[PDB]
Design a protein around this ligand. Structure first.
Ligand SMILES: [Mg+2]
Ligand SMILES: [Mg+2]
Ligand SMILES: [Mg+2]
Ligand SMILES: [Mg+2]
Ligand SMILES: [Mg+2]
Ligand SMILES: [Mg+2]
Ligand SMILES: [Mg+2]
Ligand SMILES: [Mg+2]
Ligand SMILES: [Mg+2]
Ligand SMILES: [Mg+2]
Ligand SMILES: [Mg+2]
Ligand SMILES: [Mg+2]
Ligand SMILES: [Mg+2]
Ligand SMILES: [Mg+2]
Ligand SMILES: [Mg+2]
Ligand SMILES: [Mg+2]
Ligand SMILES: [Mg+2]
Ligand SMILES: [Mg+2]
Ligand SMILES: [Mg+2]
Ligand SMILES: [Mg+2]
Ligand SMILES: [Zn+2]
Lengths: 143, 82, 141, 145, 53, 63, 167, 100, 103
RNA sequence: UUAAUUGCGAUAACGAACGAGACCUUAACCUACUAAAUAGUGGUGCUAGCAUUUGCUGGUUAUCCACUUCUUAGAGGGACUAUCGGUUUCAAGCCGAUGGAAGUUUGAGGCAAUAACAGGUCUGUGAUGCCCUUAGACGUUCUGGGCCGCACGCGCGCUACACUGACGGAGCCAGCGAGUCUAACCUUGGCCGAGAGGUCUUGGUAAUCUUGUGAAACUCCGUCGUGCUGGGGAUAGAGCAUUGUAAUUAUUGCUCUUCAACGAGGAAUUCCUAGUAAGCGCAAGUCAUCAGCUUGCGUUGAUUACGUCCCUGCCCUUUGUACACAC
């Protein structure tokens, strides 16, 4: 039949790919992980502190698979949120740029995503093939 | 500083945070005969915390004592398995 | 050539174009199947036209929908209106009009807005208030 | 789903840094009781001490908690980025400290009396009890004390 | 003296003034026309702005 | 309300005075001859006049 | 190298500025408006007045100095800006010409009723459907009041006011 | 030759008659063309208070200026291009031609 | 899962049980405003039933661990049985008592 | 009778005018016209992955070809309460249903009469009469303050007082608009930095680029758990950045720490009848920097009337008046 990332739900796909990336253990996590908040508009670090980087990697991998090419500013706007500015009304605030830049560099190192013409990062064919295989595995779980 | 209100105090409940053997076999023996089982049901009938209620719900449905009807977040609905 | 039509559903600001051609029976939305439209209750709300008219009328035709604008539920309403209009347009062009009129009768008997776009439009905001009607506050002393 | 029957070694209160740290709540939010220790500092300390942050405070070993207070009172020795610190590049010693339970009040009083003895505008403002961050004082803070 | 009128007027309300009346308050700086709002209300018809709704 | 003004009523009755055998009991044909037979600046006003002429023709057919 | 929005508001304020300039100095020539036509190789400014011999002067000396003035002020190249004069028709159907004639009559010292009735008679004789002049301010007393002089009928509401009424 | 004519006016019927006489001259010379593509009308809005002073009811007023933009792409030699830019001069309508 | 009949049958017989049949209105009378007992339209009966049920569910779910869903569930169940511990039933009997007094 | 001195009619009045309405703009409909690599769509080539058995999901500017459904416009059409049934001297009209994109003058505005207020504004005006001042000037400019000053009293608001919830992960959708020339604007992308931000480049005078403005509320998983608590985020201390000539009575932004009242608000009182209220954010204005403000936009979307003159007032008629700066 043939499947793709569009043929599976996003949440369970991202969970399966994050678990596979954590099991593979060749992602080159930065080192200042477990210190940061992922957003100037956040107020706590991620609760799954030992994880969450493989989650962000899987999310941006699926995002680049969907799109043509994205940049760290696009990812910052995507993962930014409403900052509770104390007693003043809320406002959209973009996420941490270093997290997205380092996970993009890490995905370039592992070979999922590559640099692109017209700027940004584009999903490579290797990332395409193993994202499709991971989608195959994550929807054939229930068989 | 006038208030224009009463602000009466309450019971200040002391729901349990860690379980022991008597609470453990108590819930193992009386989560049956509960037609509808949830986190708040466990909190009100056992004086345990919401965290213990969630973990116990997962435990009992993992072995299979309670049947899930809908396992949405923020509202878990369990019945007794007969 | 291939028998194919293209229709559109609309909402407040959400529009959904739907290409309905002859195929093996695949109902995609933005390259994704119809079972993943992500309010997951309005998933049933967008299932309901094909559930009404039966899946036998979707076996030999395939539908691909591209949706823009609005919000999530607006996009869902645009999708369901688009696929209803595409199916009835296919049954108008290629199949006879008996099937077309009984299909339209079933659609409009369950819900009028399945085929007719809702005409409620945003009223502009007037000065002296946050909304179209509500004023700010009158203080006298 | 993992239930474990706790034993009698639980303690409903525990004593850290001259503060009655409450048991019966999770360890990071329990450590926020220590004045000078907020959510970020407490969470990072519980991470650097390799304790299970899911564990309650009242069931924790003496060596784990003394490792915690060691990481607290010697922050940068355990790879703390030195901009988490609430008293960094202090005015006399020049090096980055992190004040704690009573040192916070004592050092606050130290900078207040410094400003008061140099007769700075913020010092006179604090001595009068008025607002010092340039807020309007015409309408708000009427019953500030 | 050179010091007279020395102070910079590179920004703020002292840098702009109405091209018609040399007023500092109420400037319309949109589209680079730099007219006070009252003079704009007078001259809008012959500038080319009209009221339709 | 749907009360029609004296401009509509006067133009309608004048049309009926001098064009009664020409016009009929259909709004569409009455409109298609009204734009030909008079100069009206508004499509809305032309439609209003045609509707009232059709109404008055309905009235004429019964007394 | 300017955006189209700023270009169009620039020619708007340019037209308004030169119209204000022309109605300031050419008042005693019956200046009743101005029109501009930008064109490849030249922009032309058609003044519509009554006393064309007075706005021209001897051998176009006043047209020459006006062209030089607008060229110096708007930084045009010499020759790329040209001015033409035009004897406007229907002088009675021009609100600004009648207004400045009223102004000059009142400055010469005519009675306000005589001046307003003369000008409304002239406008109504000129083929107007309705004319209406208002004189406000201190008339014979320190207390101010507005006097009205009308003939014919005039409308006040709707797009017809933009279409027909000149004020 | 690949020239573009852009009309950037506010008077819509002036722009329309300019474009219509342009295209009928072009089809009279049997020239290939992408026809008049009409860009979205851009509305320049300015909202102000009606009063010069501060008092009264807070009544606002929005003065708008609609700007209409059309463009026509032509392939035609330099001599017919030169008579095209010699002709079609309308009052109040701004035109500009670009090549390549 | 509780009361294993159709839950929508439970909500419809709940609103029939808690529909207020007669209710009072505020007449002038001169100086002292009086109450006058009138009857309730069936549409207002349904509307008042829905409003009472959800208001009781909301105020009982406010500031406690019981969720609004299960709070509304037990409120609807108690109203459908007829129990005098349902908020809507208590409001119903209070309104009918005031109407009967001010007949 | 109408929303309406809007009309039917009556009639010492007849014939008119202004206002209302008509009008104009905008929002809705057009698979009917004109079109369009500065908007799209389909196919064809070239190419990526999975299935391979045709296929599915994608990418592709000089790969062309075709079209205009969606998008933009211009020219038009369309609704006039149409048809039907009731009701009314049986007229103007009103009510219900059907059809229809639209049947509250279709919705929302713009414009909007006479007469006035001794309303506001000489601090918008090189609009101004008169008076004052006019050179140690009340002109103008420079330095530094002040307009923010706080025992208190009121008016617009913003945050909230929590599980219909807070936080952490993912999922992930708008519309109105603005933007640099002799200037330095909106900024993509790459890199550095926890962050704010910095740096190297790039596109755009703009349906083309910022920008699909990937907005927020929202949804799904979890953590928390009725505890002023992981609510709430004032008041403070320390440090890092940006704008500017200059930030000290913190310009703002960011990091850590501090973690107060507030437990749903008395007498009173405001706004509101559908895509309206309310929630939610976004753009623009002022703007070197500074939104808790305003002007607009869209997103989610209720309840309750479809009435009355009781209060508060308004219109017309009659009536009484010792009122006329008029209760
Ligand atoms: Mg997020
Ligand atoms: Mg809020
Ligand atoms: Mg609103
Ligand atoms: Mg609750
Ligand atoms: Mg292709
Ligand atoms: Mg009838
Ligand atoms: Mg209207
Ligand atoms: Mg004035
Ligand atoms: Mg002030
Ligand atoms: Mg106000
Ligand atoms: Mg959340
Ligand atoms: Mg958009
Ligand atoms: Mg908080
Ligand atoms: Mg009131
Ligand atoms: Mg702003
Ligand atoms: Mg300021
Ligand atoms: Mg302001
Ligand atoms: Mg009497
Ligand atoms: Mg008297
Ligand atoms: Mg009295
Ligand atoms: Zn001015």
């Amino acid at each position: 039949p043939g499947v793709s990332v569009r043929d599976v739900a996003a949440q369970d796909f991202i969970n399966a790919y994050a678990s596979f990336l954590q099991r593979q253990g060749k992602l080159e996590v930065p080192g200042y992980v477990d210190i940061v908040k992922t957003s100037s508009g956040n107020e706590m670090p991620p609760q799954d502190a030992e994880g969450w980087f493989y989650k962000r990697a899987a999310s941006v991998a699926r995002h680049i698979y969907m799109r043509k090419q994205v940049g760290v500013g696009k990812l910052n706007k995507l993962y930014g949120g409403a900052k509770s500015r104390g007693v003043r009304p809320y406002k959209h605030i973009d996420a941490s740029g270093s997290i997205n830049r380092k996970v993009l560099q890490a995905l370039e190192k592992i070979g999922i995503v590559e640099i692109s013409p017209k700027g940004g990062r584009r999903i490579s064919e290797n990332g395409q093939r193993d994202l499709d295989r991971i989608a195959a595995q994550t929807l054939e779980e229930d068989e | 500083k006038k208030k224009w209100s009463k602000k009466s105090m309450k019971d200040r409940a002391q729901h349990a945070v860690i379980l022991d053997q008597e609470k453990y076999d108590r819930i193992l023996k009386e989560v049956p005969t509960y037609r509808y089982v949830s986190v708040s049901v466990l909190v009100d009938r056992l004086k345990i915390g919401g965290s213990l209620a969630r973990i116990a719900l997962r435990h009992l449905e993992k072995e299979g004592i309670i049947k899930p009807i809908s396992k949405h977040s923020k509202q878990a609905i369990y019945t007794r398995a007969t | 050539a291939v028998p194919s039509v293209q229709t559109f559903g609309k909402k407040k600001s959400a529009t959904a174009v739907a290409h309905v051609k002859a195929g093996k029976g695949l109902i995609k939305v933005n390259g994704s199947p119809i079972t993943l439209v992500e309010p997951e209750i309005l998933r049933f709300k967008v299932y309901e036209p094909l559930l009404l008219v039966g899946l036998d009328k979707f076996s030999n035709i395939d539908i691909r929908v591209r949706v823009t604008g609005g919000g999530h539920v607006s996009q869902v309403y645009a999708i369901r209106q688009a696929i209803a209009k595409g199916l009835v347009a296919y049954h108008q062009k290629y199949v006879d009009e008996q099937s077309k009129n009984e299909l339209k009768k079933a659609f409009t008997s369950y819900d009028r807005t399945l085929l007719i776009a809702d005409s409620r439009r945003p009223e502009p905001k007037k000065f002296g208030g946050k909304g179209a009607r509500s004023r700010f506050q009158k203080s006298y002393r | 789903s993992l239930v474990v029957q706790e034993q009698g070694s639980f303690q409903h209160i525990l004593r850290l840094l001259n503060t009655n740290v409450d048991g019966n709540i999770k360890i990071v939010y329990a450590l926020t009781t220590i004045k000078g220790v907020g959510r970020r500092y407490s969470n990072l300390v519980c991470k650097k001490a390799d304790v299970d942050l899911h564990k309650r405070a009242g069931e924790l070993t003496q060596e784990e908690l003394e490792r915690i207070v060691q990481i607290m009172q010697n922050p940068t020795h355990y790879k703390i980025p030195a901009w988490f610190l609430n008293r960094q590049n202090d005015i006399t010693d020049g090096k980055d400290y992190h004040t704690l339970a009573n040192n916070v009040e004592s050092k606050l009083r130290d900078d207040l009396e410094r400003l008061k003895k140099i007769r700075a505008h913020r010092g006179i403002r604090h001595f009068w009890g008025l607002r010092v961050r340039g807020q309007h004082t015409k309408t708000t803070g009427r019953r500030r004390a | 003296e050179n010091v007279w009128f020395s102070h910079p007027r590179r920004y703020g309300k002292g840098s702009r003034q109405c091209r018609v009346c040399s007023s500092h308050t109420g400037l319309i700086r949109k589209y680079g026309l730099n007219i006070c709002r009252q003079c704009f209300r007078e001259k809008a018809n012959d500038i080319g702005f009209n009221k339709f709704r | 309300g749907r009360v029609r003004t004296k401009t509509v009523k006067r133009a309608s009755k004048a049309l009926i005075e001098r064009y009664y055998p020409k016009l009929t009991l259909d709004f569409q044909t009455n409109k298609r001859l009204c734009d030909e037979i008079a100069t009206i600046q508004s499509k809305r006003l032309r439609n209003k006049i045609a509707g009232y002429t059709t109404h008055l023709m309905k009235r004429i057919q019964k007394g | 190298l300017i955006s189209k929005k700023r270009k169009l508001v620039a020619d708007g304020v340019f037209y308004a500025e030169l119209n204000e300039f022309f109605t300031r100095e050419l008042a005693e020539e019956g200046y009743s408006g101005v029109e501009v036509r930008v064109t490849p190789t030249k922009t032309e400014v058609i003044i519509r007045a009554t006393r064309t011999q007075d706005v021209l002067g001897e051998n176009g000396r006043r047209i020459n100095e006006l062209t030089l003035l607008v060229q110096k002020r708007f930084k045009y190249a010499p020759g790329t800006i040209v001015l033409y004069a035009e004897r406007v028709q229907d002088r009675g159907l021009s609100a600004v010409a009648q207004a400045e004639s009223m102004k000059f009559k009142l400055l010469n010292g005519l009675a306000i009723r005589r001046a307003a009735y003369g000008v409304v008679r002239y406008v109504m004789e000129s083929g107007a459907k309705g004319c209406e002049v208002v004189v406000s301010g201190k008339l014979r007393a320190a207390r101010a009041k507005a006097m009205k002089f009308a003939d014919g009928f005039l409308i006040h509401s709707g797009q017809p006011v933009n279409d027909f009424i000149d004020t | 030759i690949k020239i573009r004519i852009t009309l950037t006016s506010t008077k819509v019927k002036q722009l329309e008659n300019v474009s219509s006489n342009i295209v009928k001259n072009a089809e009279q010379h049997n020239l290939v063309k992408k026809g008049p593509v009409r860009l979205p009308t851009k509305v320049l809005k300015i909202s102000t208070r009606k009063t010069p002073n501060g008092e009264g009811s807070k009544t606002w007023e929005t003065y708008e200026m609609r700007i209409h933009k059309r463009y026509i792409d032509l392939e035609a030699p330099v001599q017919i291009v030169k008579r095209i830019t010699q002709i079609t001069i309308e009052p109040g309508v701004d035109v500009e031609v670009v090549v390549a | 899962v509780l009361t294993d009949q159709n839950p929508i049958q439970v909500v419809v017989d709940a609103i029939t049980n808690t529909g207020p049949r007669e209710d009072t209105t505020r007449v002038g009378g001169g100086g002292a405003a009086r109450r006058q007992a009138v009857d309730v339209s069936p549409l207002r009966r349904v509307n008042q039933a829905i409003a009472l049920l959800t208001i009781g569910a909301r105020e009982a779910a406010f500031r406690n661990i019981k969720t609004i869903a299960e709070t509304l569930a037990e409120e609807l169940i108690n109203a459908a049985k007829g129990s005098s511990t349902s908020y809507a039933i208590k409001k119903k009997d209070e309104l009918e008592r005031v109407a009967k007094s001010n007949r």
